[PDB]
Design a protein around this ligand. Structure first.
Ligand code: NA
Length: 240
């Protein structure tokens, strides 16, 4: 997350770290959101690689013991059937991971709340992106969980030529684009939390940013619109 601030350690209890085995150790690769005690929602492109994955919940500082982490293997990966790895702009960048064991809920570990199906945010709605992503374009991962304030940018605007043009679809949400704050590598798969009717819900799964750099003016970060996939998600969890 570029231009973020460190999160309080109990602000975003549905945030997870998806990590892969790198030698004798694990490295953070992307984010995701706990949606059942044994299911996580992330971006399809995060699990393109044939790696060994684990999920970490109750994480805050990636490089120190917090005393709150639970570590759980990934048992099954279900990617959206229409996902196409060499066409992120077509959409369907979403995947569900069934965990090996169900995690225990507490103040650091809670299920993310999903919007009702069809829900679209008005232009300029207050949202936060969270994650451990690069803190600068071509920079390094944050140590501690970051959050950044990113107002939504409605489809009519984000799909205009000076923004994203036709590359953005109705099945996506755009947020930010001020050139100071944005998503960045390592944030992918992570939540966009938006405050609606007093309650934060996860409206977005971080999907892409410009190749020109993470925080570029009029290129808001693009997220998969969770409220477009509610039935998909339910169908998958019901059938697995
Ligand atoms: Na830690």
């Amino acid at each position: 997350v570029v231009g973020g601030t460190e999160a309080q350690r109990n602000s975003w209890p549905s945030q997870i770290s998806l990590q892969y085995r790198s030698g004798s150790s694990w490295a953070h690769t992307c984010g995701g959101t706990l949606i059942r005690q044994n299911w996580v929602m992330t971006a399809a492109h995060c699990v393109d690689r044939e790696l060994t994955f684990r999920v970490v919940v109750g994480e805050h500082n990636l490089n120190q013991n917090n005393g709150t982490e639970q570590y759980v293997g990934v048992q099954k990966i279900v990617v959206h059937p229409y996902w196409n790895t060499d066409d992120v702009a077509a959409g369907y960048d979403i995947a569900l991971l069934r965990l090996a064991q169900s995690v225990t809920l507490n103040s650091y570990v809670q299920l993310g709340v999903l919007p009702r199906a069809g829900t679209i945010l008005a232009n300029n709605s207050p949202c936060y992106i969270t994650g451990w992503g690069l803190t600068r374009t071509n920079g390094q991962l944050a140590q501690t969980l970051q959050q950044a304030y990113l107002p939504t940018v409605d489809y009519a605007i984000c799909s205009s030529s000076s923004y994203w043009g036709s590359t953005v679809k109705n099945s996506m949400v755009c947020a930010g684009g001020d050139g100071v704050r944005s998503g960045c590598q390592g944030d992918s798969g992570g939540p966009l939390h938006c405050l609606v009717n007093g309650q934060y819900a996860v409206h977005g799964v971080t999907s892409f940013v410009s190749r020109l750099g993470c925080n570029v003016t009029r290129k808001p970060t693009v997220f998969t619109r969770v409220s477009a996939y509610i039935s998909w998600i339910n169908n998958v969890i019901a059938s697995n």
